[PDB]
Amino acid sequence: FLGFLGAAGSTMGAASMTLTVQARNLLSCQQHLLKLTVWGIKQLQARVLAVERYLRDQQLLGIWGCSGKLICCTNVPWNSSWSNRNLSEIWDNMTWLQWDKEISNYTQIIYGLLEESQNQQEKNEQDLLALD
Amino acid sequence: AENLWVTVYYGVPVWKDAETTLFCASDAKAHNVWATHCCVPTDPNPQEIHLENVTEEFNMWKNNMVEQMHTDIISLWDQSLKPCVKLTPLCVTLQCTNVTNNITDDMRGELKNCSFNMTTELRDKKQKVYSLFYRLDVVQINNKEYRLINCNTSAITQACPKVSFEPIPIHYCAPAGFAILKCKDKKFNGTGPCTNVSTVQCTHGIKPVVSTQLLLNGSLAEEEVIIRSENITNNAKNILVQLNESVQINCTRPNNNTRKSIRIGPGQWFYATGDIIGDIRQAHCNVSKATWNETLGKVVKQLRKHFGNNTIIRFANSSGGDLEVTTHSFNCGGEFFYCNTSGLFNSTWISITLPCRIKQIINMWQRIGQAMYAPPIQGVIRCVSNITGLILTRDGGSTNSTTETFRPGGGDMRDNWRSELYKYKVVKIEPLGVAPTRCKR
Amino acid sequence: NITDDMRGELKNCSFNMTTELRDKKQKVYSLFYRLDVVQINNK
Amino acid sequence: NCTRPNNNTRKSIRIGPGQWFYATGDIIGDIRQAHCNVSKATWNETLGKVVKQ
Ligand SMILES: *[C@@H]1O[C@H](CO)[C@@H](O[C@@H]2O[C@H](CO)[C@@H](O[C@@H]3O[C@H](CO[C@H]4O[C@H](CO)[C@@H](O)[C@H](O)[C@@H]4O)[C@@H](O)[C@H](O[C@H]4O[C@H](CO)[C@@H](O)[C@H](O)[C@@H]4O[C@H]4O[C@H](CO)[C@@H](O)[C@H](O)[C@@H]4O)[C@@H]3O)[C@H](O)[C@H]2NC(C)=O)[C@H](O)[C@H]1NC(C)=O
Ligand SMILES: *[C@@H]1O[C@H](CO[C@@H]2O[C@@H](C)[C@@H](O)[C@@H](O)[C@@H]2O)[C@@H](O[C@@H]2O[C@H](CO)[C@@H](O)[C@H](O)[C@H]2NC(C)=O)[C@H](O)[C@H]1NC(C)=O
Ligand SMILES: *[C@@H]1O[C@H](CO)[C@@H](O[C@@H]2O[C@H](CO)[C@@H](O)[C@H](O)[C@H]2NC(C)=O)[C@H](O)[C@H]1NC(C)=O
Ligand SMILES: *[C@@H]1O[C@H](CO)[C@@H](O[C@@H]2O[C@H](CO)[C@@H](O)[C@H](O)[C@H]2NC(C)=O)[C@H](O)[C@H]1NC(C)=O
Ligand SMILES: *[C@@H]1O[C@H](CO)[C@@H](O[C@@H]2O[C@H](CO)[C@@H](O)[C@H](O)[C@H]2NC(C)=O)[C@H](O)[C@H]1NC(C)=O
Ligand SMILES: *[C@@H]1O[C@H](CO)[C@@H](O[C@@H]2O[C@H](CO)[C@@H](O)[C@H](O)[C@H]2NC(C)=O)[C@H](O)[C@H]1NC(C)=O
Ligand SMILES: *[C@@H]1O[C@H](CO)[C@@H](O[C@@H]2O[C@H](CO)[C@@H](O)[C@H](O)[C@H]2NC(C)=O)[C@H](O)[C@H]1NC(C)=O
Ligand SMILES: *[C@@H]1O[C@H](CO)[C@@H](O[C@@H]2O[C@H](CO)[C@@H](O)[C@H](O)[C@H]2NC(C)=O)[C@H](O)[C@H]1NC(C)=O
Ligand SMILES: *[C@@H]1O[C@H](CO)[C@@H](O)[C@H](O)[C@H]1NC(C)=O
Ligand SMILES: *[C@@H]1O[C@H](CO)[C@@H](O)[C@H](O)[C@H]1NC(C)=O
Ligand SMILES: *[C@@H]1O[C@H](CO)[C@@H](O)[C@H](O)[C@H]1NC(C)=O
Ligand SMILES: *[C@@H]1O[C@H](CO)[C@@H](O)[C@H](O)[C@H]1NC(C)=O
Ligand SMILES: *[C@@H]1O[C@H](CO)[C@@H](O)[C@H](O)[C@H]1NC(C)=O
Ligand SMILES: *[C@@H]1O[C@H](CO)[C@@H](O)[C@H](O)[C@H]1NC(C)=O
Ligand SMILES: *[C@@H]1O[C@H](CO)[C@@H](O)[C@H](O)[C@H]1NC(C)=O
Ligand SMILES: *[C@@H]1O[C@H](CO)[C@@H](O)[C@H](O)[C@H]1NC(C)=O
Ligand SMILES: *[C@@H]1O[C@H](CO)[C@@H](O)[C@H](O)[C@H]1NC(C)=O
Ligand SMILES: *[C@@H]1O[C@H](CO)[C@@H](O)[C@H](O)[C@H]1NC(C)=O
Ligand SMILES: *[C@@H]1O[C@H](CO)[C@@H](O)[C@H](O)[C@H]1NC(C)=O
Ligand SMILES: *[C@@H]1O[C@H](CO)[C@@H](O)[C@H](O)[C@H]1NC(C)=O
Ligand SMILES: *[C@@H]1O[C@H](CO)[C@@H](O)[C@H](O)[C@H]1NC(C)=O
Ligand SMILES: *[C@@H]1O[C@H](CO)[C@@H](O)[C@H](O)[C@H]1NC(C)=O
Ligand SMILES: *[C@@H]1O[C@H](CO)[C@@H](O)[C@H](O)[C@H]1NC(C)=O
Ligand SMILES: *[C@@H]1O[C@H](CO)[C@@H](O)[C@H](O)[C@H]1NC(C)=O
């Protein structure tokens, strides 16, 4: 908790340097909870949900071939229709909150393409003469 | 022709508005109900982070943190009373007299001496007992025969004479995956964007104080009196006035009481009000006239700001309805006072003693079906508190700009929390995102 | 006003029961179906 | 088609503080027996299908 959100106003490029700050903070009595068994449930539900959300994101990175990475490259080309901007307009002079608002509607298109790309890559690994 | 390739980032600082459940935490240092349901300590030095260049929209009228305090508070009241003695056996015909010994005329007819037949610990034996009652809780049958006020409506239980309901500052904290954002900007309206924000782990300490008309013991604004409302134009809405100067109010219950323990069943005790020692006097509150008749002047200048430059502002008394609505419901020392506030709102802009009534059978505002009996306090009590804000209701909206009338209003329990949860919003953190770069596998 | 097919099917029963006060009783009555009412040892 | 032909009313009896008992009141009009109607024309065919199977 030394920047949980310190990069929020930074540009997209600059904010790429705090990815471990946000990730490490996303998976952070005695008798009362059992004597009054309403609160034991209220507390467990909050804990179970934090775990399920964490795992769903990890499963996607696994499927897309980005497991274990905070920054990962793929082979899906960027469609100009998703955002008609060049790199100097995206990485500089723009925040991640603004970018998310701009992309939002295309999130599922992009995710579907990332999954298709990884499956094609695996098919090419079961053919010993691949990519030649 | 950019030829870029959708790279993937995880741990991206993006957040969205969200509703989740917050957990309570305390100072550790604090038989009080909130000292037990607020066990987890807060950090002694909360990690607040300033967010540079962040603009965020807030709305105190749609803030779900308020709704959670309402649920948590009523939930605890309904758990604390769970193991305690039912007073069903006291719903019997009572024989009552007028308690005329050593009475101030202001108290004439206020107390009744009632005797009745009730059981002992044995199924086959009865005892004759008597106790004093306040007239508010005793209703005549069809001139000596009386019933408890709620026998045809609700069950009655005895408040546990062990459990304290004295407010303790509590803090609300976010669950993992969530964060609380705060406005530090100035003169905030309660709605709209603020440009000076920070991220926190938990809220400041908030005392769950519940009162009507006047708001006690809260945060005392900062720079000026600030008037907030959902609409202001719509006379169906309340106006919340937060003061930058507190007004000290001194309340007391002058009668020296004692108690008697009556067996009501095997292992079950009933606590009855005993004789008054010395003179019988009326309960009351003192507001310094020298502060009140200035505090309103500050409110009026700020109130005029929203209605006109040359208009008359009038403060009138409250309207009709139940004591919970028409009076200042004040909980202090363990007893429930209903004070008359007409003496505070009797003027036109262009020491004050308030009498109080005491009630023991409380049909709490929270619901209909069960009522609580509040055991009496031994000796005498005094309360000192800070008026930090007012709840006003506009009783005009008529086609006459000459003048407008305001009355004490409110009464919703949430009006006492909305003013503290005012600065906070809950958001969810969403760590994935994508963006083009000039790099492929 | 009974159809013969219903003769003996319904019973009119009165009884002493309490009111909201511990010390007071009321006399009330209601109708019952014979299936739910059993004779003690004729009224 | 099933029916209950008797026109009933209700009375509320206090049984305790905040507790009500709902009792059956007087029958309005004639007292008749409850019954169900099955079309004979369908039943004595439906069983024939069952019997073959
Ligand atoms: C806005 O904020 C203010 C400030 O916090 C708040 O006012 C404060 O309210 C609390 C509660 O009403 C007051 O606390 C009480 O003060 C009395 C005063 O006693 C003094 O003298 C005795 C003499 O021996 C000293 O021992 C004592 O330390 C004080 O000097 C206390 O007596 C109260 O304690 C008793 O009641 C408690 C209730 O749970 C018990 O837990 C405690 O053990 C005490 O009870 C014992 O003695 C009783 C005597 O008959 C006996 O019957 C019991 O069975 C038991 O043995 C308590 O401390 C506090 O002083 C107020 N502050 C000021 C400045 O007045 C406002 O109320 C708040 N406004 C709101 C919420 O609307
Ligand atoms: C870039 O994407 C377009 C299609 O995107 C459209 O808008 C999206 C929000 C969503 O609604 C899509 O379903 C839309 O189609 C691609 O153009 C499509 O190409 C296919 C190929 O056969 C064609 O059948 C579609 O009709 C085309 N859509 C349109 C509107 O003409 C385009 O090829 C993509 N470019 C790259 C480089 O991937
Ligand atoms: C908030 O915005 C200001 C400017 O709008 C940012 O300041 C710039 O920071 C870069 C960093 O190298 C400097 O080169 C610029 O000259 C600065 N601008 C000015 C006007 O001084 C500031 O960093 C932003 N805050 C965040 C968190 O990004
Ligand atoms: C992403 O979705 C939003 C809505 O969720 C789109 O905005 C709406 O677009 C329709 C188009 O007729 C308008 O009528 C709505 O008023 C718009 N809503 C808002 C809030 O402005 C948005 O255009 C979509 N973006 C893309 C790129 O398709
Ligand atoms: C309330 O009524 C009771 C009696 O029902 C009063 O108690 C009696 O007071 C006289 C005064 O000398 C005593 O001699 C009796 O022995 C008392 N009787 C009992 C049973 O204690 C009581 O004082 C009345 N209280 C008030 C405030 O008037
Ligand atoms: C946001 O509000 C805070 C108020 O808490 C401002 O912090 C104060 O800034 C003044 C500037 O001289 C300092 O003297 C105070 O001591 C600061 N207060 C605290 C508690 O440290 C802050 O500057 C405001 N930020 C913006 C951008 O206006
Ligand atoms: C306060 O609420 C009133 C009531 O809805 C709003 O005034 C009305 O707004 C509607 C919008 O279509 C108009 O058609 C009505 O004629 C308006 N009423 C009157 C009397 O003019 C009002 O704007 C709201 N004001 C604020 C500050 O929220
Ligand atoms: C609060 O106190 C005021 C006065 O101390 C009460 O006002 C009186 O109300 C009666 C009702 O008709 C009038 O006849 C008197 O003339 C009023 N007195 C004054 C000075 O105006 C008021 O009713 C009390 N409120 C409550 C809820 O009891
Ligand atoms: C008894 O109390 C009633 C309350 O209104 C009062 O009017 C009556 O005068 C009282 N009786 C005596 C003897 O004071
Ligand atoms: C207790 O019961 C007796 C029975 O006759 C009755 O006379 C007496 O008045 C009752 N006492 C009270 C206080 O109701
Ligand atoms: C209980 O009796 C009082 C007597 O005046 C009456 O006003 C009240 O409405 C009754 N309550 C119910 C629930 O019938
Ligand atoms: C009342 O206001 C004064 C003003 O400084 C403050 O010191 C005191 O602690 C306040 N009391 C309460 C109960 O908040
Ligand atoms: C409260 O606000 C008024 C507004 O004009 C101001 O004059 C007064 O000095 C303020 N009081 C404090 C304690 O700052
Ligand atoms: C403050 O609230 C009132 C009530 O809706 C509104 O009309 C006014 O524009 C608000 N002020 C700001 C700065 O949003
Ligand atoms: C209120 O002021 C009056 C003035 O004489 C005084 O007698 C009374 O005791 C005061 N009450 C409180 C609670 O201080
Ligand atoms: C409340 O009591 C304190 C006790 O010292 C006193 O100083 C103060 O002036 C009183 N407040 C009022 C409004 O009378
Ligand atoms: C109302 O009075 C204030 C006092 O300074 C002034 O600034 C404002 O312009 C006045 N408004 C109108 C409409 O005259
Ligand atoms: C309002 O003030 C006038 C001023 O003389 C006074 O006579 C009247 O009794 C006051 N009303 C209340 C309810 O105190
Ligand atoms: C008392 O209230 C009246 C209301 O109009 C006001 O005119 C008067 O100046 C106030 N007293 C003081 C000392 O300000
Ligand atoms: C009540 O009266 C008794 C009588 O001696 C006294 O001891 C006690 O202290 C008094 N309690 C008060 C005034 O709180
Ligand atoms: C009362 O009901 C019984 C039920 O079998 C019946 O035999 C008897 O004749 C009935 N009495 C009258 C008066 O109809
Ligand atoms: C009610 O009690 C009285 C007591 O004598 C008894 O005579 C009467 O028959 C009882 N009523 C019923 C319907 O049992
Ligand atoms: C059953 O058929 C008979 C034939 O007369 C009719 O009177 C009766 O109302 C019918 N019942 C139903 C439930 O339709
Ligand atoms: C049931 O009632 C409906 C009502 O229109 C009727 O058409 C149908 O024939 C009835 N069925 C039987 C089995 O009588």
Automatic annotation (TrEMBL), chain C:
Positions annotated with a glycan in the UniProt record: N1, N12, N16, N41, N42
PTM annotation, UniProt: Highly glycosylated by host. The high number of glycan on the protein is reffered to as 'glycan shield' because it contributes to hide protein sequence from adaptive immune system.
Localization annotation: Host cell membrane; Host endosome membrane; Virion membrane
Job description of the protein: Envelope glycoprotein gp160: Oligomerizes in the host endoplasmic reticulum into predominantly trimers. In a second time, gp160 transits in the host Golgi, where glycosylation is completed. The precursor is then proteolytically cleaved in the trans-Golgi and thereby activated by cellular furin or furin-like proteases to produce gp120 and gp41. Transmembrane protein gp41: Acts as a class I viral fusion protein. Under the current model, the protein has at least 3 conformational states: pre-fusion native state, pre-hairpin intermediate state, and post-fusion hairpin state. During fusion of viral and target intracellular membranes, the coiled coil regions (heptad repeats) assume a trimer-of-hairpins structure, positioning the fusion peptide in close proximity to the C-terminal region of the ectodomain. The formation of this structure appears to drive apposition and subsequent fusion of viral and target cell membranes.
Quaternary state and interactors: The mature envelope protein (Env) consists of a homotrimer of non-covalently associated gp120-gp41 heterodimers. The resulting complex protrudes from the virus surface as a spike. There seems to be as few as 10 spikes on the average virion. Surface protein gp120 interacts with host CD4, CCR5 and CXCR4. Gp120 also interacts with the C-type lectins CD209/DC-SIGN and CLEC4M/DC-SIGNR (collectively referred to as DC-SIGN(R)). Gp120 and gp41 interact with GalCer.
Misc. comment: HIV-1 lineages are divided in three main groups, M (for Major), O (for Outlier), and N (for New, or Non-M, Non-O). The vast majority of strains found worldwide belong to the group M. Group O seems to be endemic to and largely confined to Cameroon and neighboring countries in West Central Africa, where these viruses represent a small minority of HIV-1 strains. The group N is represented by a limited number of isolates from Cameroonian persons. The group M is further subdivided in 9 clades or subtypes (A to D, F to H, J and K). Inhibitors targeting HIV-1 viral envelope proteins are used as antiretroviral drugs. Attachment of virions to the cell surface via non-specific interactions and CD4 binding can be blocked by inhibitors that include cyanovirin-N, cyclotriazadisulfonamide analogs, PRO 2000, TNX 355 and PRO 542. In addition, BMS 806 can block CD4-induced conformational changes. Env interactions with the coreceptor molecules can be targeted by CCR5 antagonists including SCH-D, maraviroc (UK 427857) and aplaviroc (GW 873140), and the CXCR4 antagonist AMD 070.
Sequence similarity: Belongs to the HIV-1 env protein family.
Annotated domain remarks: The CD4-binding region is targeted by the antibody b12.
Descriptive protein name: Envelope glycoprotein gp160
